[PDB]
């Protein structure tokens, strides 16, 4: 039971970046997967969420229309496509499994730093 995260780094404003999260140890295809970010020195902030086919994917207002969450159940992988990046997107981004009433965010990725600067 773990989430293996990858991606991130330093890119210029207006650039693009893709984050990946590889799951193991549970039935990923049925799990709701969320992305959470944390600006330097700040608190936790929900970013996006994805569920089963037939459910609505959701985005925070700060990323709606620029970020795209997606999943490939055959590879047990979660993605976050980050476009039109701004200095306000600088944060450590976490992927997390959402268990709702059975454990909230009970499994977290280790997080990857995304810095937006020129």
């Amino acid at each position: 039971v773990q989430l293996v995260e990858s991606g991130g780094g330093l890119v210029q404003p207006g650039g693009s970046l893709r984050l990946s999260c590889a799951a193991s140890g549970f039935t990923f295809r049925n799990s709701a997967m969320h992305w959470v970010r944390q600006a330097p020195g700040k608190g936790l902030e929900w970013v996006s969420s994805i569920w089963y086919s037939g459910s609505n994917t959701y985005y925070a207002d700060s990323v709606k229309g620029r970020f795209t969450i997606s999943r490939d159940n055959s590879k047990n992988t979660l993605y976050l496509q980050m476009n039109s990046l701004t200095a306000e997107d600088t944060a450590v981004y976490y992927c997390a499994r959402f268990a709702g009433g059975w454990g909230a965010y009970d499994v977290w990725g280790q997080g990857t730093l995304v810095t937006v600067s020129s």
Binding site: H34, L44, Y58, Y94, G100, G103, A104, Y105, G111
Partner: protein, 106 residues
Amino acid sequence: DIVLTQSPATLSLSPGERATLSCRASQSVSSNYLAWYQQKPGQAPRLLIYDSSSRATGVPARFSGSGSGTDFTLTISSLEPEDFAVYYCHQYSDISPTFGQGTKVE
């Protein structure tokens, strides 16, 4: 949109003392879907309490959650050296998840 307000912002305590942390929601938290997380410097958040009062597997008994509606409390009965960190509350009762701003136990 449910705003979570933690208090106090900072708690300075010694090992062996009790830590009492408070989370107040601007609205009632449906089903008491409120969680507590511990985060150490440079590490990912780690679940302590969910469903307001359920202690996650592997979490020591000295951590306990209580409360309902808009008033929730996390209690650490006897602080150990490894307990000094920042603590966040988190409501997942609606489609717009929100976090408290954290309480640093120092």
